[PDB]
RNA sequence: CUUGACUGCGAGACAGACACGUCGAGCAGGUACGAAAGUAGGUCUUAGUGAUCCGGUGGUUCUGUAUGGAAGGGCCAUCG
RNA sequence: UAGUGGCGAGCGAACGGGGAUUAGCCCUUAAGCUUCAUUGAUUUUAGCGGAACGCUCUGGAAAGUGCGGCCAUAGUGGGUGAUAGCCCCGUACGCGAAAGGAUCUUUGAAGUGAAAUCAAGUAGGACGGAGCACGAGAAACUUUGUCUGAACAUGGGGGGACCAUCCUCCAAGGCUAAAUACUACUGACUGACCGAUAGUGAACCAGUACCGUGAGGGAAAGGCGAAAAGAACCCCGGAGAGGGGAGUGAAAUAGAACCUGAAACCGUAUGCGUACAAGCAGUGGGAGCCUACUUGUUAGGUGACUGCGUACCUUUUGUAUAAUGGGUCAGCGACUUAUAUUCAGUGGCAAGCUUAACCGUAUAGGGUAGGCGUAGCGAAAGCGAGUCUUAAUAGGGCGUU
């Protein structure tokens, strides 16, 4: 089914790879991922929380002045924000079947647009960025996602300075970061692990 | 649970799959005055009228 | 995400206050009087697109009337020929011929003294 | 697929019209609330059940019934889902291993609402009359 | 005569915002009567009335906080 | 939800499950904990080293352009005359402590735990209260202000009035870590937070100035430039203030009240109109005049004369209304958020669907306790594709492929 660099096929499932693309589903999984990485850490003060303004600024009548009840009204420039923020969460619920079906719809389009490149194995020996630039250049390859079955330590130490690549495992791959990089490298061990999860 | 039903409405309206069933009024404490035909036709458990369903299942917290 | 609205409010005041250009006093220079004055000038501009079609229709008729009585015929006797004859010529160019081409307007009022109805 | 090229189907997301932003938005000046009276005030809510002051239905009709505390631990299974157990024995515990029956349930009566399929043995579990027949049709048996 | 001022109901309507309200057979429990066809689910008709919640009373097959009971509750009837 | 409640408004369990944490020791004397004394160990209080770029173009200035390299366990850091992985300070990554602090750990020591010896003015009760979700209610159980008052393992308490029978426990002596709550104060990282009317009241000598007898209330005020190179000298003036030059700089209409420099408001110049004409001040028509241009049947300005014309908001049956509000400008200023729920649209799965805490090398995956669905009817026991009722399977309501 899928073809590799090292002269073989893999015969992957029609389930995990090569299904039909649902952009309504992948949009929901991308908006869900991009919101669960938001930290809702902000707050503004309400009219109760701004310092001061206990008493009325003047009497209710006789003064020819509009009705006030505190120096810290939201109309006044000292006052509180009217619907002042508190730290809230922007986490939202994907179904577990719905994350998996959206990944299974992305992998199908990475195959269909030639953005997925399968290699037999991908390992560097030295913890060195120059050694991994020189091996991605044998594949004609920049702005890559490298998806292995388990991220090894030298492959993580290389390419974590390198400007346009990431090294993920299969569990740690996510809808945004394999729709963002212009190529995805999966090993043959990765498409096995993608079919344990999705097929 | 962050929405409280009226406890006083759940005593009155039991919910079935045919609707919200209730008992009848006028069946207390003055019963020799009315006929037996009017004590017979109020003895059951009626159903709740269509104009009444929206007000009751806002009280019984279901809207 | 706070947004300050000083750039959009000044370009929106400057559109309404460019449409107020040429107005007396505070109608052309402060916004609360110029907003009302540009609204009113576009209510009048709507209304008077209808009256322009009426004010010229009266002016044509008044000159056709004045140029017909030169030839011994009123307005309403001149127009009356043409449910019986048929020139199918309108008030706009008969007023232009009553002023300018006065001999070709005399030729039309004799075709209407030939109708007699 | 690009992050620059994703959108959902038409009708999946809506604009969330905001009330009170000018008189061309359609919800100008009042925001769907109309004019005076409480429903346009803030906190302008009518309590549930309130009918302007007459006796409402939840105080005018009589209370009736008691709730049985005997039926809190009672539950019903049906013959459609008796084959979902394992090991050809339908017990009280085996109905809890498959998620057919909650915990704190200790009285199960099985009705007829489908087909049994497998030959199962129902121990310590009441069955109806039409359900006992459809189990013993499919090789079942009963004891306690 | 001495009870149909019946018991269970009730097709279908009328009124009707809702709660209410009004009109109405056949089988039985069973009936007075008529010797019988049959009439009778009160009065020539329309006023003579009062929700719920609390109590009171008589039933009940229902519930009955370990179990057997009771207490309390529910249902049905009726009173304040 | 059960209960509870002028059975109103409301208040609200437990059983049973899923987890976080994990220890029980003693009153014939103990774990544990404090204080020292030591045994190793780990941190903290400062630091040290820390890779790799040149030419060219525009420019006041290069990090930007153009070309070619390099480094990378260091590439979206800070700022350097405009935007720097290779200029600088850092960063990744290694190292480092005379002397203290703190945590952990050895193994002694003095203590403490500790009240004495398995619990008597105690349990129980009567009055009056309070609590238990429980408004004393059939009111259990717990606490007690007043008054009383036991049994002793062939005892005693509970199991929601109460009594029997079972079951399970030993009150009236104690001590116990972790999981849990909070952050005035430190430090590091972070932000679909704010950017001087915002964000702390407070970016600036702010809880200041000021107001109060006092408690207390409580402001306004940031920006020259890359560098002060902050204007030597000359001229008018009062050895002024403030200017005109000259210098400085890329720029001084960046000259210190200093980036940008808007609007109201106030001016000077120019063109046109305006001193016999009545009113929401415009609009339709429209002459003349004046500027640019090119041809004229244009473009800009002014608008004599004339037709029609009683602002705006709000509130109302209705307002030019002599009804409300607005002196004007510029900023600011009002449908939000959380948690439950219903309906619609749009999706995933589908007779099933979905997890909550929590676990997690952590938006994955696990975790299906639970919630809803597949069956209803009845107040309920219950019966179930069926009850109720009545002595009546006889007659209707609800449900049902």
Automatic annotation (TrEMBL), chain A:
Annotated segments matching region Disordered: 37-66
State the GO CC annotations: ribonucleoprotein complex; ribosome
Which terms does the record give in the GO molecular function aspect? rRNA binding; structural constituent of ribosome
Superkingdom of this protein's organism: Bacteria
**InterPro entries listed in its UniProt record:** Ribosomal_uL4 (IPR002136), Ribosomal_uL4-like (IPR013005), Ribosomal_uL4_dom_sf (IPR023574)
Q: GO annotations under biological process?
A: translation
**Ribonucleoprotein: present as a keyword of the record?**
yes
Q: Which UniProt keywords apply?
A: Ribonucleoprotein, Ribosomal protein, RNA-binding, rRNA-binding
Return the similarity comment.
Answer: Belongs to the universal ribosomal protein uL4 family.
State the oligomer form and interacting partners. Part of the 50S ribosomal subunit.
The protein's name: Large ribosomal subunit protein uL4
TrEMBL record, chain B:
Q: What ranges does the record list as Basic residues composition bias? A: 1-27
Q: Which Pfam families match?
A: Ribosomal_L35p
Keyword set for this entry? Ribonucleoprotein, Ribosomal protein
Which residues fall in a compositionally biased region of kind Basic and acidic residues? 52-63
Q: Where is this region: Disordered?
A: 1-63
One GO term (biological process): translation
List the GO cellular component terms.
cytosolic large ribosomal subunit
- What GO molecular function terms would the record report? structural constituent of ribosome
- Family matches, as InterPro entries: Ribosomal_bL35, Ribosomal_bL35-like, Ribosomal_bL35_CS, Ribosomal_bL35_sf
Top-rank taxon: Bacteria
HAMAP family (UniProt xref): Ribosomal_bL35
The entry's family comment says: Belongs to the bacterial ribosomal protein bL35 family.
Protein name from the UniProt record: Large ribosomal subunit protein bL35
* Organism, as annotated: Pseudomonas aeruginosa
From TrEMBL, chain C:
Q: Name one GO molecular function term.
A: structural constituent of ribosome
Pfam families the record matches: Ribosomal_L20
Q: CDD domains per the record?
A: Ribosomal_L20
Q: What is the designated name of this protein?
A: Large ribosomal subunit protein bL20
This protein's GO CC annotations = ribonucleoprotein complex; ribosome
The protein's matches in PROSITE patterns, at most eight in alphabetical order, are given as: RIBOSOMAL_L20
GO BP:
ribosomal large subunit assembly; translation
The alphabetical list of record keywords is: Ribonucleoprotein, Ribosomal protein, RNA-binding, rRNA-binding
Question: Family assignment?
Answer: Belongs to the bacterial ribosomal protein bL20 family.
What is this protein's function? Binds directly to 23S ribosomal RNA and is necessary for the in vitro assembly process of the 50S ribosomal subunit. It is not involved in the protein synthesizing functions of that subunit.
Q: Which residues form a coiled coil?
A: none
- NCBIfam families, per this entry? rplT_bact
UniProtKB/TrEMBL annotation, chain D:
A GO BP term here is:
translation
- Which residue numbers delimit the Large ribosomal subunit protein uL15/eL18 domain? 85-143
InterPro entries assigned: Ribosomal_uL15, Ribosomal_uL15/eL18, Ribosomal_uL15/eL18_sf, Ribosomal_uL15_bac-type, Ribosomal_uL15_CS
- The region called Disordered is annotated at 1-57
Gly residues bias spans: 21-31
Q: Which Pfam families match?
A: Ribosomal_L27A
Question: A GO molecular-function term, please?
Answer: rRNA binding
Keyword vocabulary terms for this entry:
Ribonucleoprotein, Ribosomal protein, RNA-binding, rRNA-binding
Give a Gene Ontology cellular component term annotated to this protein.
Answer: cytosolic large ribosomal subunit
Assembly and partners are described as:
Part of the 50S ribosomal subunit.
Q: Which PANTHER family match?
A: 50S RIBOSOMAL PROTEIN L15 (PTHR12934), LARGE RIBOSOMAL SUBUNIT PROTEIN UL15M (PTHR12934:SF11)
Q: Of which family is this protein a member?
A: Belongs to the universal ribosomal protein uL15 family.
Q: What does this protein do?
A: Binds to the 23S rRNA.
The protein in question is named Large ribosomal subunit protein uL15
């Amino acid at each position: 089914q899928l073809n590799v660099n090292g002269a073989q096929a893999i015969e992957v499932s029609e389930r995990t790879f090569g299904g039909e693309f649902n952009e309504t589903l992948v949009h929901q999984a991308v908006v869900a991922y991009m919101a669960g990485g938001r930290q809702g850490s902000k707050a503004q003060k309400t009219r109760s929380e701004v310092s001061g303004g206990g008493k009325k600024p003047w009497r209710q009548k006789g003064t020819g002045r509009a009705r006030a009840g505190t120096i810290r009204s939201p109309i006044w420039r000292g006052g509180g924000t009217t619907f002042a923020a508190k730290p809230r969460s922007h986490e939202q619920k994907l179904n577990k079947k719905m994350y998996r079906a959206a990944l299974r719809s992305i992998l199908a389009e990475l195959v269909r647009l030639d953005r997925l490149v399968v290699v037999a194995d991908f390992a560097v020996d030295a913890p060195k960025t120059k050694g991994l630039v020189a091996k991605l250049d044998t594949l004609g390859l920049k702005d890559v996602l490298i998806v292995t079955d388990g991220v090894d330590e030298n492959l993580y130490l290389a390419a974590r300075n390198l400007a346009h690549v990431d090294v993920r495992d299969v569990q740690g791959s996510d809808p945004v970061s394999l729709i963002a990089y212009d190529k995805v490298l999966v090993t043959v061990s990765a498409v096995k692990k993608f079919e344990e999860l999705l097929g | 649970p962050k929405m409280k039903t009226k406890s006083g409405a759940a005593k009155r309206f039991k919910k079935t799959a045919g609707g919200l069933k209730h008992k009848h009024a006028f069946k207390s404490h003055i019963l020799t005055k009315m006929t037996t035909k009017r004590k017979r036709q109020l003895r059951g458990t009626s159903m709740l009228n269509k104009s009444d369903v929206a007000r009751v299942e806002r009280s019984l917290r279901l809207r | 995400a706070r947004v300050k609205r000083g750039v959009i409010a000044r370009r929106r005041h400057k559109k309404i206050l460019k449409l107020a250009k040429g107005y007396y006093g505070a109608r052309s220079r402060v916004f609360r009087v110029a907003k009302q004055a540009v609204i009113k000038a576009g209510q009048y501009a709507y209304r008077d697109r209808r009256q322009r079609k009426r004010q010229f229709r009266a002016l044509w008729i008044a000159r056709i009337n004045a140029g017909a009585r030169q030839n011994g015929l009123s307005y309403s006797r001149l127009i009356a020929g043409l449910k019986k004859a048929a020139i199918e010529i309108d008030r706009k160019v008969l007023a232009d011929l009553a002023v300018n081409e006065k001999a070709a307007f005399t030729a039309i009022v004799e075709k209407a003294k030939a109708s007699l109805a | 697929m690009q992050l620059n090229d994703l959108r959902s189907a038409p009708g999946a997301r809506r604009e969330k019209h905001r009330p009170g932003r000018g008189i061309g938005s359609g919800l100008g000046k009042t925001g769907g609330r109309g004019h005076k009276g409480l429903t346009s005030r803030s906190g302008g809510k009518v309590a549930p059940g309130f009918e302007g002051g007459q006796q409402p239905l939840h105080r005018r009709l009589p209370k009736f019934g008691f709730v049985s505390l005997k039926a809190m631990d009672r539950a019903e299974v049906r013959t459609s889902e008796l084959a979902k157990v394992e090991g050809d024995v339908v017990s009280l515990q085996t109905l809890k291993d498959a998620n057919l029956i909650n915990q704190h349930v200790q009285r199960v009566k099985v009705m007829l609402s489908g087909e049994v399929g497998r030959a199962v043995t129902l121990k310590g579990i009441a069955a109806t009359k039409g359900a006992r027949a459809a189990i013993e049709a499919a090789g079942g048996k009963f004891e306690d």
